[PDB]
Design a protein around this ligand. Structure first.
Ligand SMILES: CCCCCCCCCCCCCC(=O)NCC(=O)O
Ligand SMILES: [Cl-]
Lengths: 97, 275
């Protein structure tokens, strides 16, 4: 019953090297609504990322989707960095493609 | 059939740098149909679902959302003093809408929360209220004695919401009736003599889906972990299920996926290819 973000990282399509895709970072179940969500490639924030309008689920906890069009490259590491006042330090969620 | 219209309103004293302090997201049947925010100050349709909307309807939505924004701004300034918890950031939320059930009957919803906790709710079937704490109780008692709120929201939920739902179902039918079949990937990762199998369904619509793990024809629901249904940005959805198994049994487990787009369930296994 903690208000920390529960985070999932996934692509719109099952990934294949060189094929256009969308990378998603979905955070949910958190409170307060202020939250930092950054999609990263090799530790560099990804260009073109967009964030959904703030919304919430039935128990009033908040959720937010961050997504970026991208072409996955082999050898790179994609991840989502999340910061929230319920967390003592940032948490990093790797994409397992 | 059965259909739902829902509005999710949020006001924040501390939204984050550059973020709007007030936001509304509207849903028809698990599909976002329009939004409002205090930066743009405009209610706008999602044009991929509603591509031919008249201006007057959305000016009316904008006028109502602007009134909501002002009310949320007042509450965020005033409720903290009434709770004697002035410091810190604060939030106000409301969810309301309507269902048209399979038999044609109507159901209304109207609930509020402050700082993420139940505040008050309104029952449009009986035109009564309930409140979760003494601050909300004072508001509730004033509203019910005056009688204006209940008449307004019975009409809002039971007439306007229903009419708008029927409108959006008709105007957005092309997007709503569409079925997108999921693409499924099965993956296995072994560690410490345990093989974790995972099954991910990518990009399906509509939202309802089931994922199960099966062995010897028998479902293994007690051993399965589900990640939950989560959205893609194009209006489709994603879902997952995982199970821990002995490495020597990896190729005996099958992930079963049921979805409206699949006349019979899909069945996928680790170590096999699907041409
Ligand atoms: C999809 C975006 C367009 C949405 C249009 C609908 C907006 C409805 C806003 C209701 C505002 C309700 C405040 C309230 O209940 N205040 C209580 C009070 O102060 O008396
Ligand atoms: Cl939602």
């Amino acid at each position: 019953a903690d208000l920390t973000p529960k985070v999932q990282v996934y692509s719109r399509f099952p990934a294949s090297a060189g094929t256009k895709n969308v990378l998603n970072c979905f955070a949910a179940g958190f409170h307060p609504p202020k939250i930092s969500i950054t999609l990263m490639k090799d530790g560099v924030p990804m260009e073109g990322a967009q964030y959904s309008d703030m919304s919430f689920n039935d128990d009033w906890t908040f959720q937010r989707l961050v997504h970026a069009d991208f072409t996955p490259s082999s050898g790179s590491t994609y991840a989502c960095k999340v910061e929230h006042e319920t967390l003592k330090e940032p948490q990093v969620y790797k994409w397992d493609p | 059939g059965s259909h739902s219209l829902r509005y999710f309103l949020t006001g924040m004293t501390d939204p984050g740098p550059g973020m709007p302090r007030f936001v509304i997201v509207g849903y028809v049947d698990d599909k976002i149909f329009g939004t409002y925010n205090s930066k743009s100050r405009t209610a706008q349709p999602i044009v991929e679902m509603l591509p031919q909307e008249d201006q007057e309807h959305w000016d009316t939505q904008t006028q109502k959302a602007q009134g909501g924004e002002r009310d949320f701004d007042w509450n965020l300034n005033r409720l903290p003093e009434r709770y004697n918890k002035s410091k810190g950031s604060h939030t106000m939320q409301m969810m309301f809408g309507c269902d048209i059930l399979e038999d044609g009957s109507i159901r209304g919803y109207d609930q509020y929360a402050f700082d993420g906790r139940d505040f008050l709710a309104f029952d449009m079937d009986t035109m009564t209220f309930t409140a979760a704490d003494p601050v909300a109780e004072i508001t509730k008692r004033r509203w019910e004695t005056e009688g204006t709120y209940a008449e307004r929201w019975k009409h809002e939920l039971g007439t306007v919401c229903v009419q708008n739902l029927r409108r959006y179902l008709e105007h957005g039918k092309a997007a709503l009736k569409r079925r997108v079949q999921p693409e499924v990937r099965v993956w296995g990762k072994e560690a410490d003599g345990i093989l974790t199998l995972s099954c991910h369904a990518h990009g399906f619509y509509p939202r309802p889906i089931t994922i199960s793990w099966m062995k010897d024809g028998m479902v293994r629901d007690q051993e399965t972990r589900w990640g939950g249904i989560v959205p893609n940005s194009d209006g489709t959805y994603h879902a997952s299920a995982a199970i821990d198994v002995l490495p020597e049994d990896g190729d005996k487990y099958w992930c079963r996926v049921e979805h409206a787009s699949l006349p019979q369930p899909g069945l996928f296994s680790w170590g096999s290819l699907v041409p």
